[PDB]
Design a protein around this ligand. Structure first.
Ligand code: HEC
Ligand code: HEC
Ligand code: HEC
Ligand code: HEC
Ligand code: HEC
Ligand code: HEC
Lengths: 180, 229, 180, 229, 180, 229
């Protein structure tokens, strides 16, 4: 096997020396990040099982109903700002779903890193059970697919619970353009 | 038709202009093809240099030449390496001029030393390293063929191929949206920025390691520089 | 990691210059062939999920019943001809199932590249639901197992719908020697 | 008891027969061991040749020698490289003769140049490349141990080892059902045929690359040629 | 960097020439061990499928119930001895479950190679069906997760049927400290 | 308070003491840095030696030196390589002495030859080899980060990094619970014991191969030996 040289950590720690307050945590990998790096997103069946387990426990579901406002979910999906060293303080962070996914069939600017999500709710018969599954996917994608390329929005603090509820309504609400 | 030639012209003046405590020009700087030899040099960087014992990319080597040959203090350059409103960059200008001296030359980096082999392996590790709050690695966006983020087509950079050849053969480049010529140092800075990572230090080992990795994937690409994007 | 030189494509283009009409298609890889080649048939969980999804939508099921004639299926299984540059026009293509699989327990000439299929229908209590899954398998193996070594017979046009219905009958008919 | 020696003997005659516009034999052809030196040559091919700057297998090398030493036009040989009823192949006879001058010699290809390393890597990529209407690669049938296709045992060729040593140490070979001696060029042609691929061009780069990959897997195998299969 | 796997076998055979009575067999690998070794426990989808199918067939279920004595099961779990060239003749082999797993929440000496099994039975509502699944998991962990690093206790002859029944009772009996 | 220095002292005497039929010391033994040259030697082992055509770890090289320089038969030391109550080990003592001459030196083995590259590959296979009645491989226990077996923390040894660097930079070591200085040969014997494998033959090829694999992962580790554990 190819191996990454040990010197990589030193290279990182000495190449990123201008650090915003607290940002050294951005250089520090958590356990899942580390395994997905070493295995190049292809963990063994055992490793994949371990990842999925560790990630599922971290998901925090809402107290009541999962669906929020699809109108506000549209904004989450369209916004790709937030979290960058260049973003002003107070910048609202987006999910940038459109960066990777087709969502509203009428929106022509969409990426293809991930699967098309057109009619996501409708093809699931608007199931409340499936909405909860979608909530979980957005909250921590790696709970159901080890080393997924999708960001773990809920667990990493990129999206709030309300924002996740809202984007879930963008997928599942029968009056969302996604389902029309 | 290509505003990148304004940088080329300024770089040519800078190359021959006496500066620093020694009051000499950059004309005897060895960029890997022998002291002063410009043709083909960009096409064969990064590379190992015996005098420093390090693998260096173009901008690192230029800073080292400024210091050792000219006695020119590089600290203000490293502080402000990218041009902006009312401020040109000596680094962008020199890089434009030097890269253009490799125009039409095919990219070839030889991993002919243990240092070069090691930096290449470090670059590969950096390319697949997932970190920060979106869990991104370069490979998230550049690890597959024929994908796009919104309406921006993404080149596959993880393996040798046409995508890698075309990308590396077209830097440095005038970026229309920025009204500036930008170098690979800036592209790496911008990539890391969008991965929600802190800014890499200018002329750092991580940037040279990633550059060496990418340039190896780009072997065979015919340089057409400066480009426009 | 060791990676394929870019020159590979150019070596192919210039080493295969006598081409039967249309056989240029044969030199070019589709996306699934490309992923399976570079991962050496071990795709990541994310890549496997994408391949299975892309392949599943390509499957064309028969309008009516799935089972054909087992006697004609026996012929599809035994036939290793067709599709080669030396095969004269009009050559009927077989599935060459025996190349890789045990099928009729009395047939001693069978390969081991694939699993034993002896009693395939009987094991599954001759289920019609399992027959349809088998149709899908023969039509496009990669819809259900990413980077399978089994050729994609239906999608690649190697076998017709009737031949696939016939070979499914060879697997599932209680009168098939496979099941006796 | 081995009809392949009929080919060996005809190749011996050809080696010493003046041909071409220069009207000379092939006796000064360099097959890697020095001009005219036969013993051990086949065991050490494919390899890099400085005069062409290419990595070359035996058949490619024989064609170049005919063209440059002999001034013999090779279009006829390339057009019909494989023998058939009532028509012998100069290429098969020369290969029989030359390979037999390595009988008892252990296979050893050194990857001593960047060109050999690259050709080896191209061979490895071709070996795992899935294509055409059955989706086959070489590795489909030759990537695991102890498998068979119908009742034909399959050698594992993707790792160094006994299977590869025994395969490559036994070509060229008399093929009983064909009543002809065949070379590695014919084996590759027949392999590609069975994968539902177009015929490879005779003495093409693809075949050399694959030959080098396999020969490196076969290192240490003691040649016993011509064989009978 | 590649090697002949026959060379590796040869290296083993010439590096291990002091063999106890009845231990020559220990240098052998079965096909599952061999495949897991060459793939570094990351088999392709196709190989994983073949492993699980070959292993599932080897599982021998008890005649009657699968729960034994939890107190005896506790001993199987705590015992890390047996089968070692330094063990005296007559040494009872254990499962050494604690080497890899948290079990009794009150036991501080446990390993982390495997998942926590705290309250395993209670989590599953003491299901007799789940008890049979755990019997199978302990008998041959690879029947359900290809290349698992958990030993195949039943299939390799490390634990008797009674021992596995006993350790299943340690996991599933309501009175086991595991479930308190 | 480090009893391992008692071994170091005894090995110093042994290095210079005439022995064997040829009645000479080990002073002219080449450990890879030139005959008699001790400093740095342990840091660069295992390695290929031209004079044997073999990759050898320190203990194998010592046994060979003893054979060909001293004419001292090495069968007695192979039978009983590990010290015990009332009996010291010449091997443990020489290894302590020689390893300590690399105290403060960074670990660096180079895969310079085909033989070292092959040995590494054997080592890697041995590390992942699922073996014997519990199916254990080295990677069962040393394949993951931050894990433990009962309350024994396990170093990850399958990838380069701090764990591998710390482990290899701290053997040989005084093992408190055994009241003895032990070498990597003993650690391997101990590991194989716990894997339910038979005892490996002392100075066997298997142990050399695993040692090279591990030492490569530990590249850059600073030796501080003899240690205490
Ligand atoms: C913005 C908050 C979103 C939302 C609402 C979704 N995504 Fe992604 N996603 C990506 C990839 C590669 C996959 C497939 C791999 C995997 O399953 O993990 C997905 C998957 C999904 C799903 C499940 C679709 C299905 O199979 O049923 C859903 C519901 C979903 N996503 C929603 C990749 C990305 C990104 C690449 C960097 C980004 C950004 C997003 N996803 C963002 C979002
Ligand atoms: C990890 C540090 C990296 C590195 C080394 C690179 N990328 Fe990216 N990248 C992204 C997008 C949208 C673009 C613009 C594409 C276009 O419109 O042409 C790029 C561009 C690059 C380039 C230049 C390519 C060219 O053809 O000129 C290079 C050399 C490059 N990147 C390297 C998107 C992303 C990401 C999306 C979330 C991620 C993550 C990265 N890039 C990461 C990196
Ligand atoms: C000729 C048309 C056939 C038919 C009727 C089948 N095969 Fe194959 N097959 C191969 C391999 C490696 C597998 C296992 C991996 C996977 O599941 O894709 C299979 C699988 C099957 C099945 C499913 C068996 C099961 O256990 O569930 C069936 C019903 C089946 N095949 C039928 C390999 C090959 C070949 C290798 C080159 C070829 C040719 C075929 N199969 C051909 C056929
Ligand atoms: C992809 C281009 C390749 C290459 C480079 C090789 N093979 Fe095959 N092969 C197959 C069968 C049935 C045989 C005969 C085996 C026997 O007689 O027992 C072979 C033979 C070879 C050889 C010669 C082996 C020998 O010992 O003489 C070589 C060098 C070789 N192959 C290389 C079957 C297949 C396939 C079945 C579908 C596929 C695909 C390939 N081979 C592909 C290739
Ligand atoms: C001693 C007899 C035992 C018993 C009773 C169990 N184990 Fe293990 N185990 C290990 C690992 C890495 C896993 C996860 C991968 C896999 O699922 O194969 C497991 C799994 C289990 C389970 C299933 C847990 C679940 O997810 O529901 C159970 C019930 C179980 N084990 C019981 C690792 C190890 C070891 C590493 C060397 C050893 C020893 C054991 N297990 C021993 C035992
Ligand atoms: C397969 C032959 C191997 C090899 C080459 C190694 N191990 Fe193990 N190991 C285990 C335990 C509990 C220890 C003690 C750790 C400590 O005392 O801190 C070790 C130790 C080692 C070392 C030394 C580590 C150090 O820091 O000094 C080395 C080099 C080593 N091992 C190599 C446990 C296990 C196993 C549990 C069942 C298995 C299997 C192995 N080890 C296998 C191997």
């Amino acid at each position: 096997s190819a191996v990454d040289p040990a010197r990589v950590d030193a290279v990182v720690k000495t190449s990123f020396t201008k650090l915003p307050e607290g940002w050294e945590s951005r250089l520090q990998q958590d356990e899942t990040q580390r395994i997905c790096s070493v295995t190049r997103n292809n963990p063994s069946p055992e490793q994949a099982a371990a990842i999925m387990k560790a990630e599922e426990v971290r998901i925090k579901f809402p107290a009541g109903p999962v669906l929020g406002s699809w109108k506000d979910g549209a904004k989450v999906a369209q916004n790709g700002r937030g979290g960058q060293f260049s973003d002003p303080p107070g910048t609202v962070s987006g999910g940038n779903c459109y960066a990777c996914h087709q969502l509203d069939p009428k929106e022509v600017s969409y990426g293809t890193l991930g699967p098309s999500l057109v009619g996501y709710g409708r093809e699931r018969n608007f199931s409340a059970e499936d909405a909860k599954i979608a909530f979980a996917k957005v909250y921590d994608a790696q709970a159901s697919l080890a080393c997924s390329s999708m960001p773990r929005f809920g667990v990493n603090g990129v999206l709030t619970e309300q924002q996740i509820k809202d984007v879930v309504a963008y997928l599942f609400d029968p009056e969302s353009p996604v389902n029309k | 038709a290509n505003p990148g030639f304004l940088n080329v012209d300024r770089g040519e003046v800078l190359w021959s202009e006496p500066r620093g405590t020694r009051n000499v020009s950059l004309e005897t700087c060895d960029l890997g093809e022998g002291p002063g030899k410009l043709e083909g040099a960009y096409a064969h960087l990064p590379r190992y240099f015996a005098d420093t014992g390090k693998v260096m990319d173009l901008e690192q080597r230029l800073l080292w030449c400024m210091e050792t040959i000219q006695g020119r203090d590089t600290k203000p350059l490293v502080a402000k390496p990218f041009s902006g409103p009312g401020r040109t960059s000596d680094m962008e200008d020199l890089v434009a001029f030097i890269a253009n001296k490799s125009d039409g030359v095919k990219i070839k980096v030889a991993l002919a030393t243990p240092q070069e082999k090691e930096m290449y392996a470090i670059g590969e590790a950096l390319f697949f390293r997932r970190s920060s709050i979106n869990d991104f690695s370069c490979s998230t966006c550049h690890g597959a063929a024929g994908k796009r983020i919104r309406l921006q087509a993404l080149p596959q950079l993880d393996v040798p191929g046409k995508d890698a050849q075309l990308t590396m053969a077209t830097w440095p480049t005038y970026r229309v949206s920025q009204s500036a010529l930008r170098t690979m140092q800036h592209r790496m800075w911008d990539c890391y920025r969008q991965m929600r990572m802190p800014a890499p230090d200018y002329a750092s080992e991580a940037v040279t390691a990633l550059t060496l990795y990418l340039t190896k994937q780009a072997e065979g690409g015919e340089l057409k520089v400066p480009s426009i994007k």
